[PDB]
Amino acid sequence: GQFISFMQEIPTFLQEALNIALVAVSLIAIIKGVVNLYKSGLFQFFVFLALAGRSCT
Amino acid sequence: GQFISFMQEIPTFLQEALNIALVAVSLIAIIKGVVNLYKSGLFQFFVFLALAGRSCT
Amino acid sequence: GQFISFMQEIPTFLQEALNIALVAVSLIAIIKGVVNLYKSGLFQFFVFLALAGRSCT
Amino acid sequence: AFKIGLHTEFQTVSFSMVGLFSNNPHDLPLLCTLNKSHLYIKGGNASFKISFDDIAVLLPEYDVIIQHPADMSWCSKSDDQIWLSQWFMNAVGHDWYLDPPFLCRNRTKTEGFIFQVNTSKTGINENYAKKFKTGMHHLYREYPDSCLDGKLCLMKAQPTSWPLQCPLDHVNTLHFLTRGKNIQLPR
Amino acid sequence: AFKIGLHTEFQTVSFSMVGLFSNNPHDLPLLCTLNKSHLYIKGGNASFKISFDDIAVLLPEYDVIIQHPADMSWCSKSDDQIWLSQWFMNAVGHDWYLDPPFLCRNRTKTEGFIFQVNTSKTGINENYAKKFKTGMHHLYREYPDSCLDGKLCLMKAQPTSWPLQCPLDHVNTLHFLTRGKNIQLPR
Amino acid sequence: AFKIGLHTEFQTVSFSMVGLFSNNPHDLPLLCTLNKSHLYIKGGNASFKISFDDIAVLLPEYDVIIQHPADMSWCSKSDDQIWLSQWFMNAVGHDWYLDPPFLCRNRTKTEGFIFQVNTSKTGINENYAKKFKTGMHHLYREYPDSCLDGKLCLMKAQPTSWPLQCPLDHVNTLHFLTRGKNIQLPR
Amino acid sequence: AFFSWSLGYCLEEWMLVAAKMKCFGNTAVAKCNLNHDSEFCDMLRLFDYNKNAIKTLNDETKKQVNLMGQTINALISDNLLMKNKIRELMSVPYCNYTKFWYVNHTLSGQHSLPRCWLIKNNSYLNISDFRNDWILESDFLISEMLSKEYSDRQGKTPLTLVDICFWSTVFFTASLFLHLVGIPTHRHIRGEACPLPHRLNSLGGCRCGKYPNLKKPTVWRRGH
Amino acid sequence: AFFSWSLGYCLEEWMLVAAKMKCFGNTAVAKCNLNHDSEFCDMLRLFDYNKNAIKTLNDETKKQVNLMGQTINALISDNLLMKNKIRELMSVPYCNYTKFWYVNHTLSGQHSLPRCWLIKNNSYLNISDFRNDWILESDFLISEMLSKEYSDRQGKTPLTLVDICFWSTVFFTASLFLHLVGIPTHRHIRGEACPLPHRLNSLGGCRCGKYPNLKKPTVWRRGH
Amino acid sequence: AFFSWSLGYCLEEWMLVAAKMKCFGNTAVAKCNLNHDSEFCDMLRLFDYNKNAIKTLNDETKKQVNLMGQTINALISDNLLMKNKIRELMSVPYCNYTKFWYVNHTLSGQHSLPRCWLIKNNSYLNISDFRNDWILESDFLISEMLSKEYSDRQGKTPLTLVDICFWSTVFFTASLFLHLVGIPTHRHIRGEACPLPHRLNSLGGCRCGKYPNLKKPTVWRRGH
Ligand SMILES: *[C@@H]1O[C@H](CO)[C@@H](O[C@@H]2O[C@H](CO)[C@@H](O[C@@H]3O[C@H](CO)[C@@H](O)[C@H](O)[C@@H]3O)[C@H](O)[C@H]2NC(C)=O)[C@H](O)[C@H]1NC(C)=O
Ligand SMILES: *[C@@H]1O[C@H](CO)[C@@H](O[C@@H]2O[C@H](CO)[C@@H](O[C@@H]3O[C@H](CO)[C@@H](O)[C@H](O)[C@@H]3O)[C@H](O)[C@H]2NC(C)=O)[C@H](O)[C@H]1NC(C)=O
Ligand SMILES: *[C@@H]1O[C@H](CO)[C@@H](O[C@@H]2O[C@H](CO)[C@@H](O[C@@H]3O[C@H](CO)[C@@H](O)[C@H](O)[C@@H]3O)[C@H](O)[C@H]2NC(C)=O)[C@H](O)[C@H]1NC(C)=O
Ligand SMILES: *[C@@H]1O[C@H](CO)[C@@H](O[C@@H]2O[C@H](CO)[C@@H](O[C@@H]3O[C@H](CO)[C@@H](O)[C@H](O)[C@@H]3O)[C@H](O)[C@H]2NC(C)=O)[C@H](O)[C@H]1NC(C)=O
Ligand SMILES: *[C@@H]1O[C@H](CO)[C@@H](O[C@@H]2O[C@H](CO)[C@@H](O[C@@H]3O[C@H](CO)[C@@H](O)[C@H](O)[C@@H]3O)[C@H](O)[C@H]2NC(C)=O)[C@H](O)[C@H]1NC(C)=O
Ligand SMILES: *[C@@H]1O[C@H](CO)[C@@H](O[C@@H]2O[C@H](CO)[C@@H](O[C@@H]3O[C@H](CO)[C@@H](O)[C@H](O)[C@@H]3O)[C@H](O)[C@H]2NC(C)=O)[C@H](O)[C@H]1NC(C)=O
Ligand SMILES: *C(=O)CCCCCCCCCCCCC
Ligand SMILES: *C(=O)CCCCCCCCCCCCC
Ligand SMILES: *C(=O)CCCCCCCCCCCCC
Ligand SMILES: *[C@@H]1O[C@H](CO)[C@@H](O)[C@H](O)[C@H]1NC(C)=O
Ligand SMILES: *[C@@H]1O[C@H](CO)[C@@H](O)[C@H](O)[C@H]1NC(C)=O
Ligand SMILES: *[C@@H]1O[C@H](CO)[C@@H](O)[C@H](O)[C@H]1NC(C)=O
Ligand SMILES: *[C@@H]1O[C@H](CO)[C@@H](O)[C@H](O)[C@H]1NC(C)=O
Ligand SMILES: *[C@@H]1O[C@H](CO)[C@@H](O)[C@H](O)[C@H]1NC(C)=O
Ligand SMILES: *[C@@H]1O[C@H](CO)[C@@H](O)[C@H](O)[C@H]1NC(C)=O
Ligand SMILES: *[C@@H]1O[C@H](CO)[C@@H](O)[C@H](O)[C@H]1NC(C)=O
Ligand SMILES: *[C@@H]1O[C@H](CO)[C@@H](O)[C@H](O)[C@H]1NC(C)=O
Ligand SMILES: *[C@@H]1O[C@H](CO)[C@@H](O)[C@H](O)[C@H]1NC(C)=O
Ligand SMILES: *[C@@H]1O[C@H](CO)[C@@H](O)[C@H](O)[C@H]1NC(C)=O
Ligand SMILES: *[C@@H]1O[C@H](CO)[C@@H](O)[C@H](O)[C@H]1NC(C)=O
Ligand SMILES: *[C@@H]1O[C@H](CO)[C@@H](O)[C@H](O)[C@H]1NC(C)=O
Ligand SMILES: *[C@@H]1O[C@H](CO)[C@@H](O)[C@H](O)[C@H]1NC(C)=O
Ligand SMILES: *[C@@H]1O[C@H](CO)[C@@H](O)[C@H](O)[C@H]1NC(C)=O
Ligand SMILES: *[C@@H]1O[C@H](CO)[C@@H](O)[C@H](O)[C@H]1NC(C)=O
């Protein structure tokens, strides 16, 4: 719930070097976690089990 | 020392979502650290040096 | 800036087990990060692009 | 009230006065100053008016020289006026056994009610003048302080109808209660 | 004292009273109220008993009308009784120069010692009655407040032996010390 | 001031006294004690010296027995001495209507100015002696407390030149201002 | 009871000039449970005593409610009011217990404690001689709000738990790296295949005689 | 000295009705080094003055220990006792400085400051009209204990150290991932082997003439 | 105004015995904006009133600055001075408002609030009977400095941000490990090659008939 208030208050504490550093590291961590998981193959197994049996190729 | 008092007080702050989340992540981190280290092979080198020379196989 | 004051005050809070543990983990993390990055190969690509074209070998 | 900063606002709150005064379990004596000269003190049913000037309407030779509250019964026919006068003089500080007395009229005289005190800043009664100045300063917020150091200065208090425009302040009432010792408020 | 919550307990601590009183470097005057009527004040060696009723045992015409502590020497032969009476009247508030006096007996009379004050809530002595009511309320925790507003009410104080069952409270002693100014406790 | 610990230092700050006293908007009465006996009180222009001993220089039969500040005008020709004496006695606590009076000289007599009070710890004036002892203790930091409980003890105050070596302390001045009520400091 | 609340409190309509029910924040009101230098809270105590007075009066009791100088002296702070009158004597700003202002954070409803609007020469003080106060007041309000929101979660979780989580995380990272870099398992003969299971001994041979003890060079690897 | 301790203090046997030596916690006792609205601490100050009195008396000194109204007025809080008597006048709960209660945490020995058990009509107050207090008292006790235990370690470690540890950890994780994903080192010819050490140049050839500059396609890999 | 500052304040030359301008720290001076038991701050208030007195006098005003017992009583704390005189009566240490000492941290300029150097028998107290105080004073000074430096950054960053960073970091580590250990993708026939793209179905075959449905054993691997 306080996340929405954080978005509302974003242009108040954004004038701090540590704040931008923390938000940047959080964003890069989230995005590379997503890309790394896509490199892992869980959704690859999802499409594998979806394709299992229905199609030869 | 305060760890024992923590075990004594466990069913007092256990009624908090963040508390159960933190204890769960700590436990899963510990267990997968142990299993990952067993996958590494330090104890494999232990049994290697134990078996070194005494047995051909 | 406060880092210099930290170096000045080092032999004041150094008499704490948690303090030495934290400084040791920080130092080992920094050094193995450096060695791991050297194992990665970014500077290897630096020397690769430096050697590119000028020398056959 | 206006926006200050980026999400904050500046606004003020003002407390009522007539409700607090009309709502107290007892009846409080209230002091007031209207225009820049006219001082007023209202007790239970005595709405006394106080002024300062160098006009001597009373003389020690032919008057009553009140020294004790017991003699005050010889001045007015109503007990409320006696109570108000005695307690006002007690609040300003007039311990009746070591100070000059003050002058009033015999009640049977056909000239109403009035009491007056001389506070001229001269050789004699200089200490009394300074004490009365301090009491007036403490019992009235913005004291005009008439009758500056000079020839003569006499204060007079007379009974008049209570004007319906006095700002019912409460700081002066608090100081009157604090300075006055063992003051008993009726009702 | 019982378990509250899951690891916490609720328990109380009570402070002793006889040790604090018997342990003070000086001797403290203690006030007490026994049953629902009998008031008691014990000083150094004066164990005075106070009651209220509309019985007039003393009269102004044939008595000593004490106005000053100097005249109090004409009532009792022991200085402790004089000290206790004077300081009790000072504590309740009886500034001796602006108030009605109080009546006592000549010492050579063969009828013991007693002092009495009239506090009937009538036209005269109404202000004194209210002041004494406030003093009694401040100097006694649960004041019975006998002799309600009516015909007459006189308080009497007489010397009796100190009963060995009074709850030795200390709030009343603190109020007696606070109200009484420049009270000198012996020993 | 020296090094304590590993990076911390211990050092002290002392406040000046002559600047604060010479810098006050008014003139403050200052009390002092020199050597181990000589007590001094300096007001506006009265540099009074106080001593204690069992020497009776004044007698009730042939003197002025001052009971009220009004009679004090019959002792000295300068108003500052009268002000200082009256306010010092008021500060130590001498409410003039319930206490024994104190003795002084007629002004026309050719023997200077002096006032004296007897405080011998005997049967009569024992309460006054204890009250004066408490006042002296409160108005002087390290009271020598001469004339111990015995035959006689009389305090004398006389006018002498102000010595230029008294430690201008300020705790005693604060206590003098606190004990003295409605004291008016000139200039 | 009287104003010693332990945690909101609203000011009724008849108490305010605007004649509207205005609830003040409980946290802000609870600030002066020990403050003796807040004229706003002195007025609050006076009004609470008055409220108890109407409660008694309409309850039709016999309470001997004496009103005298000592009662009001005990209610309000004598020292503060005397200091205010002192500041009135010399011509410096003061306030006659009637006007109060505060900085309001309109998004979360949190507000600062209302100070006193100082006066001078029978007039109020405008923004020209007063701007230096509300800026730092608002900054401190934001800082206090952030600190309180942090302490709310702070005072409900154990330090041992977070310390355990931190140490478990650092061990997790260390072991992850240990897996990642890889540590050689056994020795292969240079130029040959994996000797497992009949693996060479310390001096490069076997005690059973199948592998000659030639002290052949070995290289440590992970796989076969 | 008197009760201005800077950090436990126990109540002797003769002071308590149970007549047993009861040590109160030092942290709880130190709470009222500035509080003026705690009857328990007023009684504590009175008893400390009495204790110093026996010390002087049995030391056989000549101290002029005057006992008068002003002394006791200076010892206890006049305002608090006057407020208590005021609350006594109108029929509302008060306490006559004799009974105090507290919430005790029996595992660590930490206890709350003993409040005053209010009285009314010559009787004590039972749990029916009093249950709303001790619940929040115990909750605040637990919160205060947790906050104090946190602040104990908090006020002995530097913020710069933990910041350095956090940044070192995040860099460690980033570099670990950089090792893990792998970054291609050099270019191999599509369909051929590794050209190293005689490796092809930008336009797919060599300046020495061994490898023709045919602009052959290349793929970036790590290994050989 | 008077001493109610809301945040440094220096002591002028004529006020100090050393006759040198000595700036005290603003944070330390601001400590006693509510303390009533600090003789140093009582002297500070007295000197501030005197300073305002010279300001008025050299401004040539008509202010009726009455100096009486009540004014000084309102300025200094009557209770504290009365307690000091009480402690003077019985022979126990006290201080006559003239000498103060503090512990100074010379590297950052932070200093403790100056206490009062107690006296006895017309003499000061030396280190033999006083060493137990300044050690804990310095320890508390260091602890307070560390706590203040921490709280400075503490009250300027949001808890939600750091919580988001922590959860993002733990997810980052978890996914990094998930990449590292490796999870098998598809099934290869035991003893054969990779069937992709014409991959075997659940029962080990194909619906198009190219791969017979023989229920051949399969092993899950990542690569081809
Ligand atoms: C209220 O107090 C003032 C104080 O000034 C009284 O006025 C003063 O009255 C006395 C009467 O004896 C005057 O003394 C005489 O004055 C002249 C010289 O000034 C001369 O006849 C004598 O040598 C003697 O000193 C005094 O001067 C006079 N004050 C002034 C400034 O003229 C006033 O009468 C008092 N009011 C009442 C109603 O009692
Ligand atoms: C203590 O004070 C009471 C106050 O009531 C005294 O009783 C009062 O005594 C006076 C004596 O003059 C009575 O005044 C006279 O009463 C009647 C009418 O009531 C009549 O003879 C006269 O017109 C005059 O007013 C007064 O009434 C009486 N009070 C009551 C309520 O009867 C009492 O005597 C005092 N006690 C002592 C021991 O002095
Ligand atoms: C200041 O007070 C002291 C208090 O002692 C006065 O001395 C006392 O003077 C009275 C005068 O009547 C003495 O009383 C008589 O004394 C003897 C027996 O002691 C005898 O003649 C009588 O029976 C009567 O009691 C009293 O004793 C005496 N005190 C002492 C200790 O001797 C002193 O005179 C006062 N000073 C001034 C200047 O007034
Ligand atoms: C001292 O406190 C009093 C209240 O006890 C303040 O009085 C206020 O004075 C202002 C003028 O400065 C009044 O405003 C005027 O009020 C009426 C409203 O019908 C009307 O004459 C004007 O339109 C104007 O608004 C204000 O009402 C009044 N407040 C109260 C509650 O009575 C006074 O300002 C304070 N003293 C100083 C020196 O500021
Ligand atoms: C005011 O404080 C006093 C103490 O100063 C409290 O007195 C206490 O009163 C209770 C009864 O409510 C006493 O309990 C009884 O005590 C004796 C013990 O032998 C006996 O009569 C009964 O068995 C019963 O336990 C209690 O002892 C007493 N406490 C003290 C220390 O004397 C009083 O309760 C307070 N006032 C009110 C209105 O509660
Ligand atoms: C009470 O406070 C006073 C100040 O109001 C303290 O007086 C101080 O006393 C010492 C001696 O103990 C003085 O030191 C001496 O001062 C002069 C300097 O020329 C000289 O005689 C000696 O060389 C020595 O340094 C000190 O100056 C003085 N301070 C002031 C500000 O006057 C006094 O110590 C305090 N009371 C007690 C019992 O300590
Ligand atoms: C109020 O709005 C609730 C705030 C909850 C914040 C949770 C943050 C979760 C971070 C997202 C991680 C996503 C990983 C795939
Ligand atoms: C008091 O009991 C001491 C508490 C110490 C807690 C240490 C926690 C250590 C975490 C275990 C890591 C194990 C890694 C293999
Ligand atoms: C004042 O001196 C500034 C203090 C800034 C400290 C920054 C710490 C950075 C840690 C080094 C990481 C290096 C990674 C290669
Ligand atoms: C007093 O004020 C009233 C109200 O404004 C005004 O009508 C009247 O003239 C004033 N009187 C004097 C004497 O100033
Ligand atoms: C007028 O009142 C005074 C004041 O007591 C009194 O002395 C005088 O006798 C009264 N006059 C008459 C005619 O009664
Ligand atoms: C007073 O109380 C005592 C003790 O209980 C009792 O014996 C006696 O009868 C009581 N007296 C009255 C008059 O109530
Ligand atoms: C009785 O005492 C009184 C009180 O002073 C006194 O006036 C009276 O003379 C005494 N009686 C005798 C017979 O001495
Ligand atoms: C008083 O002190 C001064 C200054 O030291 C000294 O000269 C003088 O002799 C002393 N007098 C007495 C009586 O002790
Ligand atoms: C001396 O002064 C006294 C004190 O009032 C006075 O009574 C007396 O008459 C004066 N002497 C002369 C001779 O005037
Ligand atoms: C702050 O302003 C908001 C605006 O909606 C209002 O609701 C709130 O009550 C104000 N806070 C106060 C008065 O404390
Ligand atoms: C006060 O205000 C009045 C007008 O209301 C003005 O004439 C006067 O000069 C002002 N005084 C001061 C000291 O500012
Ligand atoms: C205060 O200053 C502002 C500046 O804009 C001005 O508008 C306003 O009138 C001033 N107030 C007073 C009372 O002078
Ligand atoms: C709380 O209860 C425990 C039970 O063992 C006791 O030891 C401890 O003293 C109590 N705490 C107090 C009285 O502060
Ligand atoms: C007080 O208690 C008594 C019994 O002790 C009872 O009769 C009376 O009604 C009670 N009064 C109130 C006001 O509760
Ligand atoms: C308080 O309420 C409880 C409820 O169980 C009851 O047992 C107890 O007697 C009550 N106490 C009083 C004094 O009425
Ligand atoms: C502490 O000592 C240093 C030494 O350089 C000094 O500059 C500083 O002012 C001192 N701190 C104080 C007096 O608060
Ligand atoms: C006080 O000091 C003096 C010397 O200045 C000495 O003679 C005396 O014994 C000391 N007294 C005490 C009680 O220490
Ligand atoms: C205090 O003790 C120290 C110990 O070294 C000593 O040098 C010093 O003289 C003592 N001070 C006093 C006043 O006795």
Author numbering:
A (entry chain F), B (entry chain K), C (entry chain A): 2 to 58
D (entry chain L), E (entry chain B), F (entry chain G): 61 to 247
G (entry chain M), H (entry chain C), I (entry chain H): 252 to 258, 269 to 485
From the study:
New World mammarenaviruses (NWMs) are enveloped zoonotic agents that can cause human hemorrhagic fevers; they include Machupo (MACV), Guanarito (GTOV), Sabia (SABV), Chapare (CHAV), and Junin (JUNV) viruses. NWMs exist as quasispecies and contain a bisegmented, negative-sense, single-stranded RNA genome whose small (S) segment encodes for a nucleoprotein and a glycoprotein precursor polypeptide. That precursor is processed by the human peptidases SPase and subtilase SK1/S1P into three polypeptides: a stable signal peptide (SSP), a receptor-binding domain (GP1), and a membrane-associated domain (GP2)6,7. Three copies of each non-covalently associate as part of a mature, 3-fold symmetric homotrimeric membrane integral glycoprotein complex (GPC) that alone decorates the surface of the NWM envelope.
While two distinct approaches of NWM GP1 targeting have been described, the structures and neutralization mechanisms of other therapeutically effective JUNV-targeting antibodies, such as the monoclonal J199,29,30 remain unknown. Lacking a structural basis for J199 activity, we set out to determine its PV GPC-bound structure. Following the same processing pipeline used to obtain the CR1–28Fab-GPC structure, we obtained a C3 symmetric map of the J199Fab-JUNV GPC at 3.8 Å resolution. That map showed sufficiently resolved density for the J199Fab to allow for the identification of its epitope and paratope; it revealed an interaction mediated in part by the insertion of Tyr105 into the GP1 cleft. While GP1 residues in the J199 epitope display minimal structural rearrangement compared to their CR1–28-bound state, binding of the J199Fab induces a symmetric ∼15° rotation of GP1 trimers about the central 3-fold axis of the GPC. The structure of J199 adds new insights to the current models for direct JUNV GPC neutralization. However, the in situ structure of J199Fab-GPC reveals an unexpected, cooperative reorganization of the GP1 homotrimer to a more closed state compared to the domain arrangement in the CR1–28-bound state. While the functional consequences of this effect are not fully understood, this induced restructuring may play a role in the selective and potent inhibition of JUNV by huJ199, as demonstrated by its ability to protect against infection with lethal isolates Romero and Espindola in a cynomolgus monkey model of Argentine hemorrhagic fever (AHF)30 and its greater potency compared to blockade of hTfR1-mediated JUNV internalization alone.
